[model samples]
Target: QDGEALFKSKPCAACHSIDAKMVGPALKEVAAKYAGQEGAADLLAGHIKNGTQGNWGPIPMPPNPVTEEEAKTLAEWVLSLK
Candidate 1:
C-alpha cells in the first residue's frame, strides 16, 4: 500500500529525489509545480512511463521501467508531499 517502497525499489531515485533536486526535480517540487491541476496524477503517471521533454528543462526524463499502475501509485504518493 506504500508507493514509497516502489519509488525507491523501482529506482526512480537514481535520478529523482523526494527532498532535493537531482538529475530531475525533487518529487516535492514536482508536487508543488503540478499542485491541484486536474488529472495531475494521470499526467505524472504517463510521464513516468512515457517520459517527458522540455517540461522541466533540457535534461529530459527518459521512459522508465515502471508499470502503469506502479507509476500511478507513485504519482499519487508524490502528490501527497508539500
Candidate 2:
C-alpha cells in the first residue's frame, strides 16, 4: 500500500495500472513478463532511473528523480501488483 501510494504520489500512476493497460503496459503483465528472469530487479531499477522508449511503445517514460531505494520499492510494488 505504501509503495502503491508512493507510485501514484510520485506520478508513476499516470502511465501505469495494475489490471488495465494504459500509457504504459499493465504492470501485472509486466511483472509476469519479467518473472523468473535473472537480475529482473536491477533491470527494472535501471529502467526507472534511465527511462525507456521504443521497446514498449513510442511514448517515452520520462526520467524521474527516483532514488535507488525508491526504485526498489516501486519495482517490487509493481511486480507485486500482479
Question: Which candidate number maximizes TM-score?
Answer: 1
Q: Model 1: residues >4 Å from true position, as ranges?
A: none
User: What lDDT tens digits, residue by residue, belong to model 1 across residues 1-82?
Assistant: 4689998787788998889989999999999999979999999999998999898899889998888888899889989987
Q: How much is 16 displaced in model 2, in angstroms?
A: 0.9
Per residue, candidate 2 scores C-alpha lDDT tens digits across 1-82 of 4667777778787888778999998888989988887888887877886798876888998886788888888787776765
Q: What C-alpha lDDT do the candidate models reach, one value each?
A: 0.89, 0.80
| lDDT score for residue 43 of model 2 | 79
Error of 2 at 81 (Å): 2.6
Residue 21 displacement (Å), model 2: 0.7
RMSD, one per candidate, in order: 1.1, 1.6
